[PDB]
Amino acid sequence: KQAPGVSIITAEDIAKRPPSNDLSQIIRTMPGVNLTGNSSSGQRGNNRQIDIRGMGPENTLILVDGKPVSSRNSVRYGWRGERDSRGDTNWVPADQVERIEVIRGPAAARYGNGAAGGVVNIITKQAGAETHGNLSVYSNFPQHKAEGASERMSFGLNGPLTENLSYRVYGNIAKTDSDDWDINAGHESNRTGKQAGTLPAGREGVRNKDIDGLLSWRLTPEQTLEFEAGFSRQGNIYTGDTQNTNSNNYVKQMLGHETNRMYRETYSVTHRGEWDFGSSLAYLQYEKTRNSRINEGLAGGTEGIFDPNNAGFYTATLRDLTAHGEVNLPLHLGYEQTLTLGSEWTEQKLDDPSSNTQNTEEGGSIPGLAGKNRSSSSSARIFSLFAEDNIELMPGTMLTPGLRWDHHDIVGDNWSPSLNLSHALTERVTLKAGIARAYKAPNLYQLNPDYLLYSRGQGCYGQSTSCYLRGNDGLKAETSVNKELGIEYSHDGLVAGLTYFRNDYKNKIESGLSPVDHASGGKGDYANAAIYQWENVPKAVVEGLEGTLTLPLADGLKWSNNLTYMLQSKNKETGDVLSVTPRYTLNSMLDWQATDDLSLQATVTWYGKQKPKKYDYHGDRVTGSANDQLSPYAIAGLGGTYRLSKNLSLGAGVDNLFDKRLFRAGNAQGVVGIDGAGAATYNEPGRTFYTSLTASF
């Protein structure tokens, strides 16, 4: 379940610690994984997503059955590197998941674009020899009414049609109620003048509808052909969230209402080949995402609030195309090795009728940029070749060198080499070392010279004057040399391991610090605004420790621990943080198999201190409550699963036994009328009872 760099979560695991709704809840408990925003602003801070080794969630590649999920690329990427997105780990319903693979650092670089942090591969339950199916229900019950309860119903059904043609289908309906509009009342940052009365929001709610169909066709003994279609729909339940935590009547009108809906549609063709020489796989996925939400402004304090002058919904459309071919070849030589060879092709078309609409009246005009009716359209194609050689030098030792080459049709050529070594020092002890250079293509917002944000000064680096931020098709890809050295003892279910990891982070893309130019014209003081671009930061570094320890107390009883400790996270240009994570994270489960038919689980999570950014948007040291830190805290939980028969199981338990609660005070830094909240940017839910029921043949 735990080796150096890699973690498996099983169906049994998902069953014993059931997630409310989103899988982030259980994925986050792996070594090296945190649940954070992408950068340090704290904006959309209750919209936290999976972060691997402090590299940010933009650098965590989500797969379902080896096929990319790109849906969040349909939400506007803002000035501070946050999207008003709930993430991409809530597309597959928990109880139809067979297992989840988390691959962190050098082992993950081979998966290419956006695996700089690592890969999360959500694997579905597949067709059997006989026909099987299940019906799963979960429902939680919070102590405090403010906090949103969650309800979940999902079914699965698979088997053969013929001797040579199988199917699997699943369908899910779920809802997570929003936190009450006022849950953060009495905890909010100091708010004065026009902003008096404003509130930082609790967690957005969501309604889910997921339907997947798959047909497997075994054409010959050594040939399988898979067809699947996927239809999902998330509509939110709004509870007052805005980028800057400003308010207006339109905001208040929409409390309790759907203000965004994401439709995600997937069709996939997969051919799987198995013959004497070796093995083949190749797939075509077409992902179509419709991001329908309410118009928001793109300037200063109006960036990320419902725009009352332009009321109503727009729809952003993401058409994502993925094709991949691989062959694996057993090879006999001076060393017993295996060669895998592969191409990959991806196309991302983005239609956004809202992001590209900032006009140049107030700040003056930009040479090369039309003020009105700029294109809605952005697109990027990567072509990729790769080979990986998995070389046995001698029993116990694998050396795995791989080369990936990527041609980005704007940014240019990338060379991502990799080397992964594992060494049996003993039967019980294994040393593992890895150094790879991973790859990040700029997102379609960073890349687009039509994409334009504006501030009168309050968000401008190194001045108080009006300034534009502009997309930059001149950008380099972000690369990271992910190093890792680890050791693990494993024997008779006794596991003890410790890994050190360092990712040297080159060309991290971010809102610029120096004006590249000035505009001409516009109104009064705001006239002739400074122009910044999305720039590559030369150097940043993350560094830390992953530990695991599993002790079998008795035959019936297992004590498991995962440790993350984050040593360093530094933008070497500004000296500020990349992300804000807990200094450490210790997850502790006691698993007692009390009877043949009863299992009992106690868990504790310890979170270390959390520190905010040192510098504001200007680059100036922040002061007062913008410096506030979150103290270390713990969350404990009990549960059980009572098996009534081979065909019926029940679960029940309590998350957060001792009701430790935290409250979003606002964003990290001060603005006019809204004091900063430092690290206090998210809501930690209180005591919550839950029950579950699973019927299966």
Q: Cβ of residue 453: shortest distance to Fe ion, in angstroms?
A: 11
Give the amino acid at 312.
G
- Of 71 and 246, the one with the shorter C-beta distance to Fe ion is 246
Point out which span in 222-230, 456-464, 500-508, 629-637 binds Fe ion (CB under 5 A): 456-464
- Of 194 and 609, the one with the shorter C-beta distance to Fe ion is 194
> Pattern 645-664, binding to Fe ion, x per CB under 5 A?
--------------------
Candidate list 57, 106, 156, 300; residue touching Fe ion; CB under 5 A: 300
Point out which span in 263-271, 273-281, 450-458, 469-477 binds Fe ion (CB under 5 A): 450-458
Cβ atoms of 286 and 345 within 8 Å: the answer is no
Cα separation, 97 vs 662, whole angstroms: 30
Position closest to Fe ion via CB: 300
Cα separation, 548 vs 4, whole angstroms: 9
Point out which span in 18-26, 164-172, 316-324, 451-459 binds Fe ion (CB under 5 A): 451-459
Beta bridge partners of 398: 392, 422
Q: Cβ of residue 519: shortest distance to Fe ion, in angstroms?
A: 16
Point out which span in 107-115, 250-258, 292-300, 490-498 binds Fe ion (CB under 5 A): 292-300
The HSE-up count of residue 225 (CA atoms within 13 Å, CB side) is 5
Q: Cβ of residue 571: shortest distance to Fe ion, in angstroms?
A: 24
The HSE-up count of residue 22 (CA atoms within 13 Å, CB side) is 20
For 154-173, b/e burial (b = at least 16 CB within 10 A) is bbbbbebeeeeebbbbbbbe
What are the φ and ψ backbone dihedral angles of 524, each rounded to 5 degrees?
A: 55, -135
> Pattern 409-448, binding to Fe ion, x per CB under 5 A?
----------------------------------------
Candidate list 264, 374, 456, 687; residue touching Fe ion; CB under 5 A: 456
> Pattern 37-76, binding to Fe ion, x per CB under 5 A?
----------------------------------------
Q: Cβ of residue 186: shortest distance to Fe ion, in angstroms?
A: 26
Candidate list 458, 528, 593, 696; residue touching Fe ion; CB under 5 A: 458
- Of 338 and 458, the one with the shorter C-beta distance to Fe ion is 458
Q: Cβ of residue 459: shortest distance to Fe ion, in angstroms?
A: 7
What is the token pair recorded at 670?
């001060």
What is the token pair recorded at 502?
């360092």
> Pattern 369-408, binding to Fe ion, x per CB under 5 A?
----------------------------------------
- Of 230 and 300, the one with the shorter C-beta distance to Fe ion is 300
- Of 301 and 666, the one with the shorter C-beta distance to Fe ion is 301
Cα separation, 635 vs 605, whole angstroms: 5
Residue 230 as a binder of Fe ion (CB under 5 A): the answer is: no
Instruction: Give the number of residues in contact with Fe ion, rule: CB under 5 A.
Output: 4
Residue 380, C-beta contacts closer than 8 angstroms, at least 6 positions apart: 347, 348, 408, 409, 410, 411, 441, 442, 444, 447
Q: Cβ of residue 458: shortest distance to Fe ion, in angstroms?
A: 4
Point out which span in 137-145, 202-210, 282-290, 298-306 binds Fe ion (CB under 5 A): 298-306
3-state DSSP percent of the chain in helix, strand and coil, to 5? 5, 55, 40
Beta bridge partners of 518: 530
Report which of 610, 668, 581 is spatially closest to residue 117, judged by C-alpha positions: 581
Report which of 635, 627, 678 is spatially closest to residue 656, judged by C-alpha positions: 635
Cα separation, 203 vs 44, whole angstroms: 10
Cα four-point dihedral sign 28, 31, 34, 39: negative
Largest CA-CA distance found in the chain, in angstroms, rounded: 79
- Of 458 and 528, the one with the shorter C-beta distance to Fe ion is 458
Q: Cβ of residue 457: shortest distance to Fe ion, in angstroms?
A: 7
Q: Cβ of residue 301: shortest distance to Fe ion, in angstroms?
A: 5
> Pattern 251-290, binding to Fe ion, x per CB under 5 A?
----------------------------------------
> What is the footprint of Fe ion within residues 100-119 (CB under 5 A)?
none
- Of 227 and 615, the one with the shorter C-beta distance to Fe ion is 615
- Of 300 and 544, the one with the shorter C-beta distance to Fe ion is 300
Cβ atoms of 39 and 169 within 8 Å: the answer is no
For every residue of 122-180, DSSP letters joined together read EEE----SS-EEEEEEEEEEESSTTSPPEEEEEEEEEEESSSSEEEEEEEEEEEEPPPP
- Of 166 and 455, the one with the shorter C-beta distance to Fe ion is 455
What is the token pair recorded at 662?
């935290």
- Of 298 and 540, the one with the shorter C-beta distance to Fe ion is 298
Residue 550, C-beta contacts closer than 8 angstroms, at least 6 positions apart: 2, 493, 494, 495, 496, 558, 559, 560, 561
SS3 599: strand
Residue corresponding to tokens 């839950």 = 690
- Of 196 and 333, the one with the shorter C-beta distance to Fe ion is 196
Q: Cβ of residue 445: shortest distance to Fe ion, in angstroms?
A: 20
Point out which span in 355-363, 430-438, 453-461, 679-687 binds Fe ion (CB under 5 A): 453-461
> Pattern 494-533, binding to Fe ion, x per CB under 5 A?
----------------------------------------
Q: Give the start-end residues of each E strand in 177-243.
A: 205-220, 223-237
- Of 379 and 458, the one with the shorter C-beta distance to Fe ion is 458
Point out which span in 218-226, 253-261, 296-304, 428-436 binds Fe ion (CB under 5 A): 296-304
- Of 76 and 456, the one with the shorter C-beta distance to Fe ion is 456
Q: Cβ of residue 244: shortest distance to Fe ion, in angstroms?
A: 9
Q: Cβ of residue 299: shortest distance to Fe ion, in angstroms?
A: 7
- Of 133 and 673, the one with the shorter C-beta distance to Fe ion is 673
Give the dihedral of Cα atoms 367, 372, 377, 379; nearest 10 deg. 20
- Of 283 and 532, the one with the shorter C-beta distance to Fe ion is 532
Cβ atoms of 418 and 402 within 8 Å: the answer is yes
Q: Is 132 buried (19+), middle (13-18) or exposed (0-12) by CB count in 10 A?
A: middle
Query: Can you give the binding site for Fe ion, defined by CB under 5 A?
Result: 300-301, 456, 458
